[PDB]
Write a protein that binds this ligand. Structure first.
Ligand SMILES: Cc1cc2nc3c(=O)[nH]c(=O)nc-3n(C[C@H](O)[C@H](O)[C@H](O)COP(=O)(O)OP(=O)(O)OC[C@H]3O[C@@H](n4cnc5c(N)ncnc54)[C@H](O)[C@@H]3O)c2cc1C
Length: 499
């Protein structure tokens, strides 16, 4: 423990942008990450386990592996009991919602599908009217794409390869309903993916890896922003260090209590770390819990009532259609999506749907979709002092508008093609729409509500939030490009005016 000029909590998108720019500005910066640095070959010689061979590396402190959502019917057979371990993917269970987040250096960039998508400017303008959309679209979004290593699939290869048959089938089906598809830019190197298919390089996307990490191809933040931040000479990263409490010191600045653990979860030390500038990049869940805890235990008593509010799951809904026998989706499906259905017009019927691959590795005729919808419902994180946890006050009926929007779009597709939903992919009960999970948690510390328009926490100086907690519950697309671009805007301004 001791003093560092700047501390960044977490190592996801908001954190990584912040630390790079701080380091470039000459500010010595310590990043504290509760998960691991994923660079140690494991028992199979790989850093990460695949989706057909999950082991303790797959899961943050659970005692059994779980099938990727949509896949239980085919992948429960590979599940096994495991030791609780500092694995890469954390299913965080709240009363009526399960939020999936990455744990490690790089955060959700380790486990996500790589999809780098800019929101519709008119929707950005609706959700954040206090922000200048011009600089976002002409400066920050381009900067983020370049630093993230966003790239584009070759359309000829896409059209030919067996690995994207699943995507072409849904494109054809959607077309019969008058719905168009879009190619989705990615941080997975598509050139690498071609060479995987050709047998020239080790497979990752083409070997059923994504949600527990990619051993190859995916340019997660440890390779992009965080590598650059380390390269400044002004940034260091301490792992298996979880920030528990934040206080304003009597002499200025912030002090943190930080627990260091081993990979089995044993407590090794509790350290006090202080700083001048404190940046929260612990995610929608993590940053919001730190601040509700600090307000409600009296260590940051001047936090406002908007801390904790305004959470939403980005309208996330999963659903699946049963194809006709003559439309097999293939046994070989790249684990990186390449196409979406863009039916998003900012109205309440809007849907942006990823055409999602399935990992079963045999023909199932199923088409899987992750829908992103416009649902005004929000939840609130409240502090439970008894257990020292933020609890998310969301109820499953709050996803009814999301279900309704997703169903209306997929009903069109089913009507045009004479197909039906699958009802058995998410559990025993007939359920065509998974409505109590989230991959894209947004809000809790909303920009302009809990913070100023650059993420400065209201009530405090030199205290910043940088991450998905800033976004008001919805962006209409996969969120990380927006988190990244918004973090570029925010840290630039903070450094210029405050540092
Ligand atoms: C299965 C899945 C698929 C997804 N697919 C996509 C996709 O293709 N495209 C897209 O745009 N988005 C996708 N997402 C969402 C995207 O990954 C997240 O929106 C993004 O990672 C959020 O960034 P963040 O900076 O807010 O936080 P995170 O990336 O979640 O990072 C927070 C970091 O802080 C650490 N941390 C938390 N609390 C503490 C603490 N108290 N002390 C220390 N460290 C702490 C965490 O361990 C983590 O490393 C996906 C996510 C999942 C789970």
């Amino acid at each position: 423990g001791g003093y560092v000029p700047a501390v960044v909590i977490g190592t996801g998108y908001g954190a990584a942008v912040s630390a790079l720019r701080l380091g470039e500005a000459g500010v010595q910066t310590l990043m504290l990450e509760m998960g691991q640095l994923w660079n140690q070959p494991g028992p199979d010689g790989n850093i990460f386990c695949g989706m057909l061979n999950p082991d303790k590396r797959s899961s943050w402190f659970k005692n059994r592996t779980e099938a990727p959502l949509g896949s239980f019917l085919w992948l429960d057979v590979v599940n096994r009991n495991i030791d609780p371990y500092a694995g890469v993917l954390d299913r965080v269970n709240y009363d009526q919602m399960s939020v999936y987040v990455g744990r490690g250096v790089g955060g959700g960039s380790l486990v996500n599908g790589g999809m780098a998508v800019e929101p519709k400017r008119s929707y950005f303008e609706e959700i954040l009217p206090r922000v200048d959309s011009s600089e976002m679209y002409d400066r920050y979004f381009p900067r983020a794409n370049s630093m993230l290593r966003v790239n584009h699939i070759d359309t000829k290869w896409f059209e030919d390869t067996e690995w994207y048959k699943f995507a072409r089938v849904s494109r054809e089906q959607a077309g019969k309903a008058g719905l168009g598809t879009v190619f989705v830019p990615n941080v997975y190197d598509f050139g690498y993916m071609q060479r995987e298919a050709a047998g020239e390089v080790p497979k990752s996307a083409l070997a059923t890896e994504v949600i527990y990490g990619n051993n190859h191809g995916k340019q997660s933040l440890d390779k992009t922003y965080l590598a650059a931040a380390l390269g400044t000479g002004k940034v260091t990263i301490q792992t298996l260090h979880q920030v528990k409490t934040i206080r304003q010191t009597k002499d200025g600045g912030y002090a943190l209590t930080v627990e260091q653990k081993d990979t089995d979860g044993k407590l090794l030390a509790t350290k006090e770390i202080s700083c001048r500038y404190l940046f929260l990049g612990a995610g929608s869940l993590g940053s919001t819990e730190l601040l509700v805890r600090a307000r409600d235990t009296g260590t940051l008593p001047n936090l406002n009532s908007e801390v904790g509010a305004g959470w939403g799951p980005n309208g996330n809904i999963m659903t699946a259609r049963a194809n006709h026998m003559w439309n097999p989706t293939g046994a070989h499906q790249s684990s990186i999506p390449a196409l979406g259905i863009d039916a998003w017009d900012n109205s309440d019927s809007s849907v942006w749907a990823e055409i999602a691959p399935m990992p079963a590795g045999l023909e199932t005729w199923v088409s899987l979709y992750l829908a992103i919808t416009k649902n005004p419902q929000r939840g609130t994180f409240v502090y439970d002092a008894a257990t020292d946890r933020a609890k998310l006050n969301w109820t499953r009926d709050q996803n009814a508008p999301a279900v309704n929007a997703a169903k209306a779009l997929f009903d069109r597709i089913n009507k045009a093609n004479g197909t039906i939903y699958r009802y058995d992919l998410f559990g025993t009960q007939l359920k065509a729409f998974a409505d109590d999970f989230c991959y894209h948690p947004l809000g809790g510390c909303v920009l302009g509500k809990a913070t100023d328009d650059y993420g400065r926490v209201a009530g405090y100086k030199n205290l910043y939030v940088t991450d998905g907690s800033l976004i008001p519950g919805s962006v209409g697309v996969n969120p990380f490009v927006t988190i990244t671009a918004l973090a570029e805007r925010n840290v630039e301004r903070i450094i210029k005016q405050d540092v």
